[PDB]
């Protein structure tokens, strides 16, 4: 508390000096990299940096990134060794962007985890002796020619000691064994998350996932699997179809032995007329749902409130493959009122105005204007200098001297159900090969493109349209099952 109260007041009061000091911390060891040498940055000088280092897009610097991805020394862009890459949900030329990465990403990520934990406990009581049923997933890595792995942000965390050796307190205590969280087969691991959460239902004081789409999926899978889950509880055995050795061993220990009475109890709850409030009925000690409900995830809020009996939905964190940005300092607000306060120790932040309210070319964090929209620009600890993020944010206020931002949209994105972010360009290519709407009225959600009939021909249209989308889409569609068959309404399905 005392340490935290002071910590937060300082971070948010001293933004100007923290940002300027951070930029010096980044630039000084990097003055001899090929990249900074190119732009004649031979010492820390903020004015020369702003004047001479260009504001770049991913495509602008891809030739440097490709070199590091292929095995060239990371000193071309960063004197802090690059030890891996992050796979962005954002795409470049149909291929997922690969951002450079090192353990500073995890230093900052864990800093934010500890900070948001304190923010939550300040405002929410009755959580410190319980566990969380957190639907957390690991995604198998992709190998690059350099031999370094490329992972999604949270997988870079789970597959590290930052997670394995995390703090032993309520916030880091889950109903699922680590083996379940680490399991790269997410169909198996989601089933196991639910089973373990049910067995330990009285201990659950929070539940959630990174994004709302995954929370909704977990509930939908519960609705479709409860009979089987209860049979495992009754018998004290995990279903044979789960092949992961880690899950088998760890979940067997959670089960312990036959629990016919607990099975009866759960079955009676699931057999009611309606699924309304099911989360709070199965997990009666839950204090809040922890999941992002901003941006494209806002579409899931009505379903969440239905299943959770208006438990608070707490949307804590805004982050990307470039850097974690910051957190929600008013966690108990309504989803539509969520703003994120950037933390000035994360990266050096600049902002390009996206409307007429601010006529500058680019501005520092401390200079953004209320009610104006911007694209964030990031200088980080892994070789990105003044990189455009492609998101649009709106200044809603200032907490002490720290600007607070509403997430508006990812620029150019037209369709999003889960982690997929299909942009106008991808959709143009698809309809060529052949308007739209993201339908989440049913699960899973699915794309809907408005365009007797040759049903073979129009079913092939749906097909070639999907085949032209990106790898994130195809993973959600064919592997996760988080996205259903694309639908063309002239109705035909892929």
Distance CA 291, CA 314 (A): 6
* Residue 243 in tokens: 């092949």
Task: List the binding residues for AMP.
Answer: 88-89, 294, 317, 321, 340, 391, 410
Interface ranges with ligand SAL (CB under 6 A):
153-154, 210, 292, 317-319, 324
| Cα-Cα-Cα-Cα dihedral sign, residues 231, 236, 241, 242 | positive
Per CB under 6 A, does 319 bind ligand AMP?
Answer: yes
**Which residues within the stretch 59-88 sit at the binding site for ligand AMP (CB under 6 A)?**
88
Q: Of 364 and 391, which has the nearer Cβ to ligand SAL?
A: 391
| Cα-Cα-Cα-Cα dihedral sign, residues 102, 104, 107, 109 | negative
Per CB under 6 A, does 100 bind ligand AMP?
Answer: no
Q: Of 317 and 345, which has the nearer Cβ to ligand AMP?
A: 317
Per CB under 6 A, does 388 bind ligand AMP?
Answer: no
Per CB under 6 A, does 90 bind ligand AMP?
Answer: yes
Beta-carbon count within 10 A of 241 CB? 9
Q: Of 78 and 317, which has the nearer Cβ to ligand SAL?
A: 317
Residue 446 near residue 466, CB atoms below 8 Å: no
Q: Of 322 and 358, which has the nearer Cβ to ligand SAL?
A: 322
Residue 154 binds what, of ligand SAL, ligand AMP, none (CB under 5 to 8 Å, by partner type)? ligand SAL
Per CB under 6 A, does 36 bind ligand AMP?
Answer: no
Q: Of 41 and 327, which has the nearer Cβ to ligand AMP?
A: 327
Least distance in Å: CB of 174 to ligand AMP?
21
Residue 112 near residue 49, CB atoms below 8 Å: no
| Cα-Cα-Cα-Cα dihedral sign, residues 23, 26, 32, 38 | negative
Q: Of 100 and 130, which has the nearer Cβ to ligand AMP?
A: 100
Q: Contact with ligand AMP (CB under 6 A): which of 318, 385, 447, 492?
A: 318
Per CB under 6 A, does 294 bind ligand AMP?
Answer: yes
| Side-chain half-sphere exposure of 299, counting CA atoms within 13 A | 16
Instruction: State which residue has the least CB distance to ligand SAL.
Output: 319
Residue 93's alpha-carbon distances to 160, 227, 412, in angstroms, are 30, 44, 14
Strand partners, 206: 132, 288
Beta strands per DSSP E along 340-434: 340-342, 348-353, 363-364, 373-379, 387-388, 391-399, 402-410, 413-415, 422-423
Per CB under 6 A, does 174 bind ligand AMP?
Answer: no
Q: Which residues bind ligand AMP (CB under 6 A)?
A: 88-90, 153, 292, 294-295, 317-321, 391, 407, 410
């Amino acid at each position: 508390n005392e340490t935290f109260e002071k910590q937060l007041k300082d971070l948010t009061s001293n933004v100007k000096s923290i940002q300027d000091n951070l930029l010096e911390e980044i630039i000084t060891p990097n003055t001899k990299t090929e990249y900074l040498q190119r732009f004649l940055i031979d010492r820390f000088d903020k004015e020369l940096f702003k004047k001479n280092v260009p504001i770049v897009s991913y495509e602008d610097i891809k030739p440097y990134l490709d070199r590091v991805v292929n095995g060239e020394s990371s000193d071309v862009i960063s004197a802090r060794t690059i030890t891996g890459f992050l796979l962005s949900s954002g795409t470049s030329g149909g291929a997922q962007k690969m951002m450079p990465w090192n353990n500073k990403y995890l230093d900052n990520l864990t800093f934010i985890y500890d900070l948001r934990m304190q923010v939550i406990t300040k405002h929410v009581k009755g959580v410190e002796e319980g566990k969380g049923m957190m639907f957390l997933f690991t995604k198998q890595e992709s190998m690059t020619p350099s031999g370094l792995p490329a992972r999604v942000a949270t997988s870079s965390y789970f597959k590290s000691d930052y997670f394995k050796n995390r703090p032993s307190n309520w916030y880091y205590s889950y109903t699922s064994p680590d083996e379940v969280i680490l399991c790269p087969n997410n169909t198996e691991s989601l089933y196991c998350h639910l089973l373990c959460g049910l067995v330990q239902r009285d201990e659950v004081v929070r539940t959630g996932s990174i994004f709302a789409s995954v929370m909704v999926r977990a509930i939908e899978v519960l609705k479709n699997s409860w009979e089987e889950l209860c049979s495992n509880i009754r018998s004290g055995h995990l279903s044979n179809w789960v092949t992961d050795l880690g899950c088998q061993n760890s979940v067997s220990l959670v089960l312990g032995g036959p629990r016919p009475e607990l099975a009866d109890t759960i079955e009676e709850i699931c057999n009611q007329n309606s699924w309304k409030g099911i989360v709070k009925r199965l997990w009666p000690n839950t204090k809040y749902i922890e999941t992002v409900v901003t941006g494209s995830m806002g579409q899931y809020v009505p379903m969440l409130n239905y299943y959770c009996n208006d438990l608070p939905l707490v949307s804590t964190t805004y982050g990307s493959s470039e850097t974690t940005f910051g957190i929600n300092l008013d966690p108990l607000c309504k989803p539509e009122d969520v703003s994120y306060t950037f933390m000035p120790n994360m990266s050096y932040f600049e902002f390009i105005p996206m409307d007429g309210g601010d006529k500058n070319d680019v501005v520092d964090l401390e200079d953004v204007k209320l009610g104006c929209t911007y694209e964030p620009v990031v200088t980080n600890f892994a070789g990105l200098y003044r990189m455009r993020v492609g998101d649009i944010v709106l200044v809603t206020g200032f907490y002490n001297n720290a600007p607070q931002f509403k997430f508006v949209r990812r620029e150019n994105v037209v369709l999003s159900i889960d982690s997929d972010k299909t942009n106008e360009e991808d959709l143009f290519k698809a309809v060529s090969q052949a308007t739209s709407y993201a339908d989440t009225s049913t699960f899973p959600g699915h794309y809907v493109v408005y365009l007797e009939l040759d049903e073979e021909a129009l079913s092939t249209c749906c097909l070639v349209m999907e085949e032209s989308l990106d790898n994130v889409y195809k993973r959600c569609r064919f592997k996760d099952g988080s996205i259903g068959p694309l639908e063309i309404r002239v109705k035909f399905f892929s």
